[PDB]
A paper describes a structure:
Herein we present the high-resolution crystal structure of the origin binding domain (OBD) from the JCV initiator protein large T-antigen.
JCV OBD region B3 (residues 216–220) is poorly ordered in crystal forms 1 and 2, but well ordered in form 3. This dimer contains a small interface (∼550 Å2) that is buried between the adjacent JCV OBDs. Therefore, we examined the higher order structure that the JCV T-ag OBD adopts in crystal form 1. The angle between the monomers is ∼900 and the rise per monomer is ∼9 Å.
Residue numbers in the entry: 134 to 261
Amino acid sequence: EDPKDFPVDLHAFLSQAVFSNRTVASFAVYTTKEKAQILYKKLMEKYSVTFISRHGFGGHNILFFLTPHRHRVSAINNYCQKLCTFSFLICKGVNKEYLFYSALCRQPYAVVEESIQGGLKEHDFNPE
């Protein structure tokens, strides 16, 4: 059985309003390692990301990315789903950027690749 949602330990950081027509600038994707490998570079280029990271979790991968322009979650999901038939893929907006990335850099998650050397810094966002 493929996952039907992100792991529960990330729920608090994610927006559940997948049909929201508000535009946002931070997204997450949960899919296979094969599809995430491909999407890491495709999304980097498509959305001119300011940051993207790919993380492993129990054989699958999670992508996290930030964009210089805002987008609807539905648009990003549509683009990602184009790659899959087939493979599962969950796409949600991220409400708590630094907390989400931080969780993805601690067990049980691991960073596999990221687009800025040294990753995101706490000081790159305002405090909570």
